[PDB]
Amino acid sequence: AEGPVTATKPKEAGFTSEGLARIDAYLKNEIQAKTMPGAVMMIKRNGETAYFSSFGLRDPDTKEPMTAETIFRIYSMSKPITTVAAMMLVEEGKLQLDEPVSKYIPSFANVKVGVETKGENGMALETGPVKRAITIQDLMRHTSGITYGFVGDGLVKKAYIASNLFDGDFDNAEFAERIAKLPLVYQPGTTWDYGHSTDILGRVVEVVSGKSLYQFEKERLLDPLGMKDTGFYVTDPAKKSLVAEAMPNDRKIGGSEMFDPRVQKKWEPGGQGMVSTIGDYARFTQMVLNGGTLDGKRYLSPKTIAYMGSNHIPQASGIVPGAYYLPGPGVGFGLGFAVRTEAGVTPVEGSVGDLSWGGAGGTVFWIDPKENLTVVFMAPMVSPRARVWRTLRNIVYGAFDRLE
Numbered sequence: 011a012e013g014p015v016t017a018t019k020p021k022e023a024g025f026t027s028e029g030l031a032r033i034d035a036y037l038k039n040e041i042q043a044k045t046m047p048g049a050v051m052m053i054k055r056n057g058e059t060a061y062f063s064s065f066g067l068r069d070p071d072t073k074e075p076m077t078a079e080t081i082f083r084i085y086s087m088s089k090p091i092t093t094v095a096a097m098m099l100v101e102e103g104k105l106q107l108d109e110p111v112s113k114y115i116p117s118f119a120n121v122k123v124g125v126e127t128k129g130e131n132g133m134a135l136e137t138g139p140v141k142r143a144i145t146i147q148d149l150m151r152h153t154s155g156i157t158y159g160f161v162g163d164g165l166v167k168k169a170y171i172a173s174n175l176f177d178g179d180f181d182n183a184e185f186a187e188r189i190a191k192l193p194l195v196y197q198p199g200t201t202w203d204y205g206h207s208t209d210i211l212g213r214v215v216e217v218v219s220g221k222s223l224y225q226f227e228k229e230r231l232l233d234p235l236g237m238k239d240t241g242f243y244v245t246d247p248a249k250k251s252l253v254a255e256a257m258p259n260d261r262k263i264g265g266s267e268m269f270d271p272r273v274q275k276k277w278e279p280g281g282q283g284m285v286s287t288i289g290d291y292a293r294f295t296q297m298v299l300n301g302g303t304l305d306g307k308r309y310l311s312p313k314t315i316a317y318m319g320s321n322h323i324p325q326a327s328g329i330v331p332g333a334y335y336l337p338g339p340g341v342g343f344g345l346g347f348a349v350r351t352e353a354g355v356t357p358v359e360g361s362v363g364d365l366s367w368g369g370a371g372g373t374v375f376w377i378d379p380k381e382n383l384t385v386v387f388m389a390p391m392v393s394p395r396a397r398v399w400r401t402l403r404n405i406v407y408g409a410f411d412r413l414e
Contacts, residue, residue, distance in 0.1 A: 011038050011066065012065050012066065012076065013063055013064075014062060014063050015050075015052075015078045017059075018059050018060055018061055018062060019060065021411070022056060022058045023053070023054070023056055023058040023060030023061075024056060024060075024381075024410060024411055024412045024413075024414065025055070025409045025411055026410075026411045029405075029408060029409025029410070029411070030053075030409050032405050032409060033061065033063075033402070033405050033406070033409070036402075036405055037051070038065060040398065041065055041066045044257055045391060045394050045398065046066070046257070046372065046391040046394075047067040047069060047070040047076070047256070047257060047389075048064065048065055048068055048254075048390075049065055049066065049388065050064040050065075050076055050288050050388050050389070051063060051288070051386070051387045051388070051402070052288055052289075052292050052385070052386050052387075053383070054383070054384050054385075055383040056414070062078075064076045064080075068252070068255070068390070069254065069255040070255065071255065072255075074251060076254070077252075078287070078288060078289060079239070079252060079287060080287065081239055081252045081253050081254065081271075081285050081286070081287055082285065082286060082288075082373055082388045083254075083269070083271055083285055083369070083371045084284050084285065084286050084291070084371065084373045085283075085284075086281065086282060086367055086368060086369040087291065087374075088283060088369075089208045089281055089346050090298075090346040090367060091231070091240075092211055092212050092215070092227075092281065093150055093208070093211065093318065094309070094310060094318075094346070095215050095226060095230065096146070096214065096215050097310055097314055098309065099218050099219065101311065104218050104219075105146060107146045107150070108145055108146070108147065110144065111154070112143055112144070114213075114214045114217040114218065115186050115210065115213060115214065115217065117190035118186075118190050118210075121140060121144070121192075121193070121194055122137040122138060122139065122140070122193050123137065123155060123193060123197050123198075124136070124137050124166040124193030124194065125137070125138065126165050133165060135165045135169070140194065140198050141197055144156070144199075145198070145199065146211070147322070147345075148199050148207070149210055149211040150207075150211065151329075151343055152202055152204055153196075153198070153203075153329055154194070154198055154199075154205070154207045155195055155197060155201075156189060156194065156205040156206050156207045156210060157194075157205035157206070158170070158205045159171040159175070160264040160265060161205075161334055162333060164195065164333070166195040170192055173191070173192060175189070179277070180276060181222075181276040181277060181278070182212055182216055182223060182277065182278060183213060185206075185209055186209070186210050189206050189209070196332060200328070201329065201330055201331070202330070203334065204334065206281060208279075208282075208346075209281040211281075212278070212279060212280025222278060223280055224241060224278045228241070230309070231294075234309075235293050235304060235309070236290075237286065237290035237291075237293055237294065239286060239289075240284065240285070240286040240287070240290045240291070241284065241286075242271070242277075242278045242283045242285065243271050243274040244271045244272050244285055253271060254388070254390040255268075255390055256268070256372065256390040256391050257391070260392050260393050261392070263370045263371065264370075282370075288387075288388050291373075292386045295375055295377050295386060297309060298319075299379065299384050301316070317344075318347065319344055319347060319379070320344050321343065321349050321351055322342075322345060323342055323343050324342060324351070338356060338357075339355050339356060339357075340352030340354070341356055344365070346367070347366065347377075348366050348367055349363065349364070357400070358404060359403050359404050359406075360376070360403055360407065361378045361381055362380070364377065364380070364381075371390060371392065372388065372389045372392065373389075374386075374388075374395070374399040374402075375387070380414065381410075381414045385406055387402055
């Protein structure tokens with residue numbers, strides 16, 4: 011427990027105080043159940059802060075309190091930021107969505123597609139050529155054939171694991187080469203499958219800009235937006251104790267302990283390596299809700315934002331869901347965002363057109379243009395994250411007193 015971080019205007023935000031109180035009760039109960047050591051959450055609607063509270067601890071071992079300034083490993087929430095960075099280059103005519111990835115990273119020109127088939131001793135992989143080159147758009151919407159070794163199962167995924175992709179101290183250029191040596195799980199441009207595509211996109215950004223992913227983002231987005239505690243590593247000695255840590259029995263991601271952001275390394279993966287704070291990320295999402303601008307500064311045009319927020323894998327795309335379609339029924343996917351397409355069907359409340367994504371470390375956010383709403387939630391945890399995120403959606407929408 012703890013309470014509000016700042017003053018709030020729930021009624022003007024279109025919520026009831028009784029409804030929002032349900033969030034307090036839920037979070038405190040989950041903390042008591044040891045689902046997480048603590049949590050911080052912010053809800054903004056109609057340009058007003060409807061809710062902003064923190065509860066519990068940011069670290070169960072040190073017993074340090076959960077605060078608004080607490081730094082979280084945001085993992086996959088790094089993707090929308092990486093994608094926005096790439097789209098800035100697109101707006102300047104320095105990158106195109108239909109261009110082949112191989113144009114920037116040659117090793118991807120000759121990747122092969124693995125297909126499971128019966129052999130003398132069980133299932134084995136047959137490999138063949140791609141029918142189409144992987145495009146920049148494919149990377150942005152996860153229809154490139156590039157996957158994640160630890161998500162679901164399969165022979166290609168087992169090959170990812172066997173290749174020990176995360177050994178040593180390597181940079182984005184080297185990681186891209188490691189990925190390029192592996193077979194794809196699906197033909198490029200045909201199937202949605204979550205994977206390392208965004209890490210590859212990050213390298214594309216470096217090739218085009220001539221800068222490291224972090225420096226490019228720092229200059230074009232992080233500094234101007236005021237996201238002073240957002241990056242890939244916590245190098246400021248005064249900020250190292252602010253890193254949130256999950257319960258002892260829930261610190262494993264992909265079969266390994268969470269990386270230590272307090273120790274700088276060469277890798278700056280655009281799909282999973284960032285650290286940030288709720289305040290920093292809220293500015294990023296507000297910028298997106300605003301159509302690409304914040305505090306008088308424009309980062310992307312409103313057309314570009316609308317384009318990123320559109321479904322890029324509907325029927326007209328011919329794209330089909332892969333074996334592990336994470337967004338689930340009633341939800342599509344755009345350029346770095348899951349996009350709700352059905353009012354019902356999806357088993358959680360929300361609005362057609364709302365944008366969202368989460369991180370394996372417990373963080374999640376969503377932007378609802380129809381309801382002029384943005385929500386950011388951060389709590390260090392892994393196994394129960396999806397359950398908590400879905401429940402929070404229900405509670406937030408369940409606290410509405412009116413529709414916009």
